[PDB]
């Protein structure tokens, strides 16, 4: 069944006024909270 869920609305006009690219908010908001997978690394003979 449907459940409550937080909704964040980025005010497009305000963002341009303060000179913040919308493509940066979508990353900080999406990477800080949702987690991001940047790249791989080699450890103990395996890639992680």
């Amino acid at each position: 069944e449907d459940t409550p869920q937080f909704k964040i609305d980025i005010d497009q006009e305000k963002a341009q006024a303060l000179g913040v690219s919308i493509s940066d908010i979508n990353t900080t908001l999406g990477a800080a909270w949702g987690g991001s997978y940047v790249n791989d690394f080699i450890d103990r003979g395996r890639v992680k």
Partner: protein, 48 residues
């Protein structure tokens, strides 16, 4: 989703503060992906 929403996109804010929306530089409407093909059944609109 709506064409109204697309027409509300913000391209850039003028130095005077006036907004330059997408609808101010482009006519938005729902159209076909490709207009190359145009079918006709007994001289009547159709598709298949």
């Amino acid at each position: 989703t709506n064409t109204e929403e697309f027409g509300n996109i913000l391209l850039k804010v003028n130095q005077d503060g006036s907004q330059v929306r997408l609808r101010d530089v482009a006519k938005i409407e729902l159209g076909g992906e490709s207009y190359d093909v145009v079918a006709k059944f007994n001289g009547q609109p159709a598709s298949g």
